[PDB]
């Protein structure tokens, strides 16, 4: 049965104008910037961007690869689908 989110879980995350994303719940570095209230940092994999989301826009990465995990023109999609698929907890500075 499932569990909240936590920093390292494999996510699509979904942004208004993108296609689902293969992304990773990150966690915050000592003295960094945290997210807002029910917000999670979400990075991104191939654009390396983050952005604070709810779980509304959280799919699990596992179930939802069928659906969401296949070649896309946008910049830095094909890129991430390898991260999340080869090295998905990896840092990416």
Same mark, same amino acid.
């Given at each position: 049965?499932?569990?909240?989110?936590?920093? $390292?879980?494999?996510? *699509?995350?979904?942004?208004?104008? %993108?296609?689902?994303?293969?992304?990773?719940?990150?966690?915050?570095?000592?003295?960094?910037?945290?997210?807002?209230?029910?917000?999670?940092?979400?990075?991104? *994999?191939?654009?390396?961007?983050?952005? *604070?989301? $709810?779980?509304?826009?959280? *799919?699990?990465?596992?179930?939802?690869?069928?659906? %969401? $995990?296949?070649?896309?023109?946008?910049?830095?999609?094909?890129? $991430?689908?390898?991260?999340?698929?080869?090295?998905?907890?990896?840092?990416?500075?």
């Amino acid at each position: 049965m499932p569990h909240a989110f936590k920093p $390292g879980d494999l996510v *699509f995350a979904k942004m208004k104008g %993108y296609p689902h994303w293969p992304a990773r719940i990150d966690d915050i570095a000592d003295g960094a910037v945290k997210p807002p209230p029910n917000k999670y940092p979400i990075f991104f *994999f191939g654009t390396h961007e983050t952005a *604070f989301l $709810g779980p509304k826009d959280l *799919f699990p990465y596992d179930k939802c690869k069928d659906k %969401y $995990g296949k070649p896309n023109k946008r910049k830095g999609f094909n890129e $991430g689908l390898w991260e999340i698929q080869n090295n998905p907890h990896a840092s990416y500075s």
